[PDB]
């Protein structure tokens, strides 16, 4: 297992350009390709990034490129925030994967609200920080997500994508 | 694995009898002989229970032999109890083990007290059950035993006791 079918699983894969929930030009794994109403400005975007004339239409290879692109960038968007980084540095890499599909999620304003949580992460008190994860809003929202993530927080296997 | 080893490792075997912390003979797994002052009855009272002139000495056989009718008072106790039956009519073997453990080290009394961790074991919540039993003041007195059962309770395995 990886980050990317962790991701393709808890977020979807889609081939072909279509707007998010406020209406933006996305791709592959919740790419965010321009924030422009013009569609073909999301094109032009989508042909810079992968170097093909796409007419907004890509294969699975191209979107796992965009997407190793979206996790260097959230790598250095966490390592350049002093709530994130110190958490980050000090978790496994199956661990770190739970965080950037946290920030995938909600961004790393909203990674950075779960003070408690992230602190427990970094003194490697899996079962408490997992439990406290739980009572989040963010597991009332999304539960099937954040239990999975949850799980890979407290086990650090990908043991809740085996049959996924 | 079983309730034996179980409890063996939880609890503790002695083969020798001894005093427990309110001062009555003990022996094998927390087993109480009598509440008198005198060892001389406590070994009265075990040489009925194995039938041989013991001294107040037995063998691992002996006090699994104990154990077993000490189990089974206990699971008539559950059955007696109507704060105790549905959930350990509910649970499978393993589970019950769990709820079983928790009958020796603190009382029918004592388990019938966890009102909503048992309505979420009855409702197969697992994981919050288990949350919900780490915020005890049980877990705060006796973490690594209650640590063992909590896993029991959430996997419904004997993993905890794998390293024991």
Avoid at 53 to 71: P, R
């Amino acid at each position: 297992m990886n980050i990317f079918e962790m991701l393709r699983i808890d977020e979807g894969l889609r081939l072909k350009i279509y707007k998010d929930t406020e209406g933006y030009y996305t791709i592959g794994i919740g790419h965010l390709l321009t924030k422009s109403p013009s569609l073909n400005a999301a094109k032009s975007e989508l042909d810079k990034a992968i170097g093909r004339n796409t007419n907004g239409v890509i294969t699975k290879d191209e979107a796992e490129k965009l997407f190793n692109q979206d996790v260097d960038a959230a790598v250095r968007g966490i390592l350049r925030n002093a709530k994130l980084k110190p958490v980050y540095d000090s978790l496994d890499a199956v661990r770190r994967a739970a965080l950037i599909n946290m920030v995938f999620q909600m961004g790393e304003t909203g990674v950075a609200g779960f003070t408690n949580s992230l602190r427990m992460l970094q003194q490697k008190r899996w079962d408490e920080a997992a439990c406290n994860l739980a009572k989040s809003r963010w597991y009332n929202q999304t539960p099937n997500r954040a239990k999975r993530v949850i799980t890979t927080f407290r086990t650090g296997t990908w043991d809740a994508y085996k049959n996924l």
